[PDB]
Enzyme design. Sequence first.
Site, PDB file in Angstrom:
ATOM      1  N   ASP A   1       0.767  -1.236   0.000  1.00 13.97           N
ATOM      2  CA  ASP A   1       0.000   0.000   0.000  1.00 13.97           C
ATOM      3  C   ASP A   1       0.808   1.302   0.000  1.00 13.97           C
ATOM      4  O   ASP A   1       1.373   1.699   1.023  1.00 13.97           O
ATOM      5  CB  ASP A   1      -0.941  -0.044   1.206  1.00 13.97           C
ATOM      6  CG  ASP A   1      -1.856   1.149   1.280  1.00 13.97           C
ATOM      7  OD1 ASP A   1      -2.090   1.799   0.235  1.00 13.97           O
ATOM      8  OD2 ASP A   1      -2.357   1.425   2.387  1.00 13.97           O
TER       9      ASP A   1
ATOM     10  N   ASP B   1      -1.819   5.581  -5.364  1.00 14.77           N
ATOM     11  CA  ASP B   1      -2.094   4.623  -4.313  1.00 14.77           C
ATOM     12  C   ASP B   1      -2.434   3.204  -4.748  1.00 14.77           C
ATOM     13  O   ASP B   1      -3.527   2.939  -5.225  1.00 14.77           O
ATOM     14  CB  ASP B   1      -3.214   5.218  -3.452  1.00 14.77           C
ATOM     15  CG  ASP B   1      -3.653   4.311  -2.343  1.00 14.77           C
ATOM     16  OD1 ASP B   1      -2.929   3.346  -2.028  1.00 14.77           O
ATOM     17  OD2 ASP B   1      -4.732   4.587  -1.780  1.00 14.77           O
TER      18      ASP B   1
HETATM   19  C1  LIG Z   1      -7.764  -3.021  -2.690  1.00 11.22           C
HETATM   20  C2  LIG Z   1      -8.166  -3.251  -1.268  1.00 11.22           C
HETATM   21  C3  LIG Z   1      -7.375  -2.449  -0.277  1.00 11.22           C
HETATM   22  O1  LIG Z   1      -7.766  -2.886   1.007  1.00 11.22           O
HETATM   23  C4  LIG Z   1      -7.590  -2.130   2.127  1.00 11.22           C
HETATM   24  C5  LIG Z   1      -7.513  -2.643   3.445  1.00 11.22           C
HETATM   25  C6  LIG Z   1      -7.341  -1.788   4.555  1.00 11.22           C
HETATM   26  C7  LIG Z   1      -7.185  -0.406   4.390  1.00 11.22           C
HETATM   27  C8  LIG Z   1      -6.998   0.470   5.558  1.00 11.22           C
HETATM   28  C9  LIG Z   1      -7.839   0.429   6.715  1.00 11.22           C
HETATM   29  S1  LIG Z   1      -7.373   1.513   7.938  1.00 11.22           S
HETATM   30  C10 LIG Z   1      -6.074   2.076   7.028  1.00 11.22           C
HETATM   31  C11 LIG Z   1      -5.175   3.078   7.532  1.00 11.22           C
HETATM   32  C12 LIG Z   1      -5.644   4.449   7.571  1.00 11.22           C
HETATM   33  C13 LIG Z   1      -4.796   5.465   8.045  1.00 11.22           C
HETATM   34  C14 LIG Z   1      -3.470   5.168   8.430  1.00 11.22           C
HETATM   35  C15 LIG Z   1      -2.995   3.840   8.392  1.00 11.22           C
HETATM   36  C16 LIG Z   1      -3.825   2.797   7.921  1.00 11.22           C
HETATM   37 CL1  LIG Z   1      -3.131   1.205   7.912  1.00 11.22          CL
HETATM   38  C17 LIG Z   1      -5.942   1.416   5.777  1.00 11.22           C
HETATM   39  C18 LIG Z   1      -4.855   1.786   4.781  1.00 11.22           C
HETATM   40  C19 LIG Z   1      -5.391   2.857   3.853  1.00 11.22           C
HETATM   41  O2  LIG Z   1      -6.265   3.595   4.247  1.00 11.22           O
HETATM   42  N1  LIG Z   1      -4.681   2.880   2.685  1.00 11.22           N
HETATM   43  C20 LIG Z   1      -4.946   3.639   1.689  1.00 11.22           C
HETATM   44  N2  LIG Z   1      -5.838   4.645   1.623  1.00 11.22           N
HETATM   45  N3  LIG Z   1      -4.218   3.549   0.551  1.00 11.22           N
HETATM   46  C21 LIG Z   1      -7.265   0.098   3.047  1.00 11.22           C
HETATM   47  C22 LIG Z   1      -7.434  -0.736   1.947  1.00 11.22           C
END
Ligand SMILES: CCCOc1ccc(-c2csc(-c3ccccc3Cl)c2CC(=O)NC(=N)N)cc1
Length: 368
Positions: free
Chosen positions: A34, A224
């Site tokens: 990510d 992203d």
């Molecule tokens: C293609 C599917 C992607 O699946 C995901 C699973 C979890 C998260 C997620 C949940 S809380 C969180 C999160 C939010 C803020 C800070 C840290 C994290 Cl891990 C994340 C990462 C995120 O938001 N990534 C992104 N926008 N590229 C995002 C996508």
Amino acid sequence: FVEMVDNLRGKSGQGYYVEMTVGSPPQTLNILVDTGSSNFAVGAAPHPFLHRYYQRQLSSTYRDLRKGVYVPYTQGKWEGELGTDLVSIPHGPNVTVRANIAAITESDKFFINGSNWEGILGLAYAEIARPDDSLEPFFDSLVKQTHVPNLFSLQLCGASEVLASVGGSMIIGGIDHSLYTGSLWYTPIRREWYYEVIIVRVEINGQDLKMDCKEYNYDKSIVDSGTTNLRLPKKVFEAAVKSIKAASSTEKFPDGFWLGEQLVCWQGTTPWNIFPVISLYLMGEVTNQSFRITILPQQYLRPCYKFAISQSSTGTVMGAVIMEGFYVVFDRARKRIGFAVSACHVHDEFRTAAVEGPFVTLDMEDCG
Ligand SMILES: CCCOc1ccc(-c2csc(-c3ccccc3Cl)c2CC(=O)NC(=N)N)cc1
């Protein structure tokens, strides 16, 4: 880098993951790659969607940081305990690094049923790390602790019961020339938090949306891999769909379709040619210079297909549908992101995803 080709996998729409190991002995886990976040977070407690998780008690090299992290967001949240442990990527550089690890103990709507990954590898910068920027991101630890150059490449290739399997390559510390064709064009990383960039203009099938530059980055624009769709600020999104509906017009579709929630089918009969290509012009390395990234319907329609362009309230998000079909270089050392046509990438015999430049653009410094 040969060892790193195809080191990525995922199920369409559930993200790409690379295999990693944490602890001693090595605990194998699949981690979502990510570029939209900055934490290395892994499930570390049972969960209905996890078939395996990080077990700190089993790691002789685990070191507690005695410190928690709580991450709520609109759909739910995750919560963990900070720690440090040895981390490796079997199909990546042959090194092992001690990195921070957010051990997820409780969560809701974090993990995805059937996605096959047990954690996230936030490759973005420290500024957006949770709980704050003092928690050094994994890639930073990697570069600081090893000789691996401050740069990584992402070739997301995309793709019955089962969501389609997708593949890709994450080349850490370099650029694999066999992964792309043509020239690599770079857009500056505006600021080192998210991989923020600046879109100077966009056209649908050659036609300019003619919007003020700032609307394309209203709030911000980021690259992203952690997002499936190409997400556009409302205003831009509406303008884009209108233009696409026009292009397609010869078939009409339920607007439940245009809203991404519903699907559409034909049965190799798909009329791709009816849908327009989308060109995103990114600020070039030289002021008035820019270059364009052009995607085909094959990229914004993900397989039946679902319209993979959705509205955003948090700025433009160039997710997988944009990255697929291009080789994306996250040149952290030179604060830039390069795009080149991908060795992989779906395309018919009439059009092809493209990376072209330069194109000159007046102001644009003020697109931010
Ligand atoms: C293609 C599917 C992607 O699946 C995901 C699973 C979890 C998260 C997620 C949940 S809380 C969180 C999160 C939010 C803020 C800070 C840290 C994290 Cl891990 C994340 C990462 C995120 O938001 N990534 C992104 N926008 N590229 C995002 C996508």
